[PDB]
Amino acid sequence: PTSVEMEPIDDSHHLDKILLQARELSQPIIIDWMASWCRKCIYLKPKLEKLAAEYDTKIKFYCADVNKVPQALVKRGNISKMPTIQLWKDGEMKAEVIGGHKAWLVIEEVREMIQKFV
């Protein structure tokens, strides 16, 4: 695969099920906390989907639109800026990268984060 689509997280209960599945496989997951009005988020999406393909079968990648999902799900991430790309493992957030700049550069910083926990 050259690109893998990020799966949307519906709510806190869905996050719970996602984390139980990741624990079964002893894998981390990636969550892209984003907003649809944020140009940085929009430009990052295709680059994140290319990165997700590089980790197909090893790390599942998810996304959550902070204006559409329930407020209780956004509080699970403790989000304050977008895009916030978090690595979760063993049921909790282990590290995060805050976008804000060129998408390729955010991706290299996310790659460094993945290599620490995978």
Options 9, 18, 31, 41, the catalytic residue: 41
- At 32, the amino acid letter reads D
Q: Which does 12 bind (CB under 5 to 8 A by kind): K ion, Cl ion, none?
A: Cl ion
Pattern 74-103, K ion, x by CB under 5 A: ----x-x-----------------------
Whether residue 38 lies in the annotated active site? yes
Q: Which does 80 bind (CB under 5 to 8 A by kind): K ion, Cl ion, none?
A: K ion
* Residue pair 59/48 in contact by the 8 Å Cβ criterion: no
Query: Cβ closer to K ion: 24 or 92?
Result: 92
- Helix 39-54 crosses helix 103-117 at what angle (to 10 degrees)? 40
Per-residue CA distances from 107 to 24, 39, 53, 68, 71 (Å)? 27, 15, 13, 24, 27
Omega before 83 within 30 of 0, i.e. cis? yes
Token pair recorded at residue 19: 């984390």
Q: How far is the CB of 116 from Cl ion (least distance, A)?
A: 29
Whether residue 37 lies in the annotated active site? no
Q: How far is the CB of 93 from Cl ion (least distance, A)?
A: 16
Q: Looking at 5, 11, 16, 56, which residue binds Cl ion (CB under 5 A)?
A: 11
